[model samples]
Target chain A: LYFQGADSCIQFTRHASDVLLNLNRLRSRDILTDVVIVVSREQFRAHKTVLMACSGLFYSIFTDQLKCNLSVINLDPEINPEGFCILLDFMYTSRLNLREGNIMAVMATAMYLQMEHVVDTCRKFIKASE
Target chain B: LYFQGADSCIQFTRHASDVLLNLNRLRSRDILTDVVIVVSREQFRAHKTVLMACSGLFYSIFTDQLKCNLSVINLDPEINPEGFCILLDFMYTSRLNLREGNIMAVMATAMYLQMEHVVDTCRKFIKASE
Candidate 1:
């Protein structure tokens, strides 16, 4: 049986969250951590491959696979671990839990992470609330 | 400013599609392909990390990182390349383009690949079409 459309293909979609949910669990349990993200004194264990796949900044920074120094990604001291934690969780869970209190905190960290989409989402959240 | 919430965090969500889309771009460009999925004489290049992240079958097969024999993943000869190709594209794009013609083909491959979600999605598409 067949249905015709613009591309002659029926479009079906889901959020593809199974992997994200699994990855988040791995992060929660500290499993298969190929990389570490350091913010100030706090450390967030994660997978380099997942990070690079999702983040432009990470893709560029870890561009060369065998180059070296990828076991830990040390972020700026100005970057608060609290906000960065939210961003990292967002990458894994596809869910961004923001509040007026933590929205700016997230934005500051997101800007450094080169996640413009997160930035955009946060901006909209701010705009709508105000 | 502050807002009240059950979790005390504003619930903002996205599909976490940036990574999927970027990974898709990487697949299109054939960049960083750590694994090869072979069906009959046809071959699809892919990244192991992304595969494992997305597919339970891939994760199970390639569970051990430093084990062995990971470069080429030889699939069943019975599997159709057309369907596998579509499945691979869906893995990257998070968009599944199905048609009455190829739905069965995809279902078979997804069964072997241990992609229950794909199977469910295909089942839904079939039900909706019928």
Candidate 2:
């Protein structure tokens, strides 16, 4: 673990090394990250959807305990709402620079993705200007 | 401060409300959140550069204090490197659905953005299958 300014960075190499060493055996990249095998879109969808529905579980654990606004959403790609595109973008690429015109649109999406960091960052950025 | 399952979220609302109420005089949206006024691109760049250079300071404060993976960077806009396109994308859009071929590129960018969560998440996701 390491920190630079208002950020913390962590890397779990043991898990990463083991998985990378066996890439040929597992064709799917996603498999390397979790113990559970999300074999199909349906499986992924179920897990994500169920996880999303468990918001109360998240609230109990976090609430006001955190200092950054970042959230996570477990969602099924198959039935993922159109709003999920922003999340997918972040999942695929970990950055966002929302435009003034689309601020609200993306904020709601970030909330759904549980991207509190993005939400707070945007909120703070917007509020600062006002 | 809060911790929810695999992710953690944080926000500084005291700062938020103070900034929000002062929005009118600030006129611009960016000033409300920060005590420092980042007026021009040059000013923003200098501040971000200084902050980014103070990474050692961040390390001292957190190092191993945190459990989640995340990072923060302060960069200047004028001399922003082209390689940072991905980081900027996430900051602006909070999403990235890079084509299959661009995964590696995006991963590197996520790392630069100090997005330890995204890095770990991607590493884990890719490792699980193996």
- Maximum-DockQ candidate: 1
Per-residue CA lDDT of model 2 for A41-85, tens digit only, reads 423221121122122232233233451133333344433343344
Return the top candidate by lDDT. Answer: 1
TM-score of each prediction: 0.77, 0.25
Checking candidate 1 for backbone clashes, the offending pairs are A98-B10
Per-prediction backbone clash count: 1, 60
Q: DockQ values for all predictions? A: 0.45, 0.02
State the lDDT of candidate 1 residue by residue for A1-130, as single tens digits.
2233366554334445565676677667665566788889998898766776667778777777563355887778888789988888777866677877889989878888888877887888889878
Superposed model 2: Cα runs more than 4 Å off: A1-83, B1-130
After TM-score superposition, what is the CA distance of residue A64 in candidate 2 from its true location, in Å? 22
Runs with alpha carbons beyond 4 Å of true place in candidate 1: A1-7, A29-32, A64-69, A120-130, B1-8, B11-13, B64-69, B120-130
* Share of native C-alpha contacts between chains A and B (below 8 angstroms) recovered by candidate 1: 0.56
- Classify candidate 2 by CAPRI docking class: incorrect
